[PDB]
């Protein structure tokens, strides 16, 4: 997250921690969110050979009580994801286990408006900048599609564009798998921007994907 403020300790009981690993050198980290005890909601470019969730945490470097560490025993990422588009960046994770629902793990209930977002996560706080122990959010004006227009690959339909250019606010590297909340509802999930960190970025649409959603959860 850059540009924005350190969140209220466990103020978002449904953020995940996501460490990837890759078949080659491991070491990536994604977000995510808690939708039921055991899936969680993330991107799906933050795929890798195994994952493993950190639910309740806000500083992740510093154990808590507040903790809940679980691995990721299917991944689903959309059938139909091209890595060459970023078309339907979505992905969910079934937990091993059905995490515990406290205070600090919870999940996420499945004039400018209404048009006014937030997004947080532990990701960079700046181009090369490190990032962030504890967990950022920012506050970030949803766009017509028109503000977008240069990502090649951009679809109306499928995403949403989010953030004032003349602002450095923004989603950045880490913060991908991130939910994106409209006056309390989560409306989208962190994707991708241009590497040289200028609003907007690209989310993922979630109202386009509630049906093939509600399908993974429906077996499983
Ligand atoms: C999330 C974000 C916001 C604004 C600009 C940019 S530029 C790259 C990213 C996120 N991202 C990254 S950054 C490092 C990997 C972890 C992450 O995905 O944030 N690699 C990607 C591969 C495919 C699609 C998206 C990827 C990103």
Redesign the pocket.
Known sequence: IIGGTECKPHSRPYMAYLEIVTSNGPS???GGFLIRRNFVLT?A??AGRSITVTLGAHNITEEEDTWQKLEVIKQFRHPKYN?ST?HH?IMLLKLKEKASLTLAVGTLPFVPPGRMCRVAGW?RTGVLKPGSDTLQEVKLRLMDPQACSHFRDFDHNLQLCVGNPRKTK????????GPLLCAGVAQGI??????D?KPP?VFTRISHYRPWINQILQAN
Do not use: P
Request: aromatic share 12%; proline share 0%.
């Open positions: 990536k980290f994604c991107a470019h933050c890595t970023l960046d990701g923004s989603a950045f590297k880490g913060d991908s798998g962190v994707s991708y921007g241009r590497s960190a970025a």
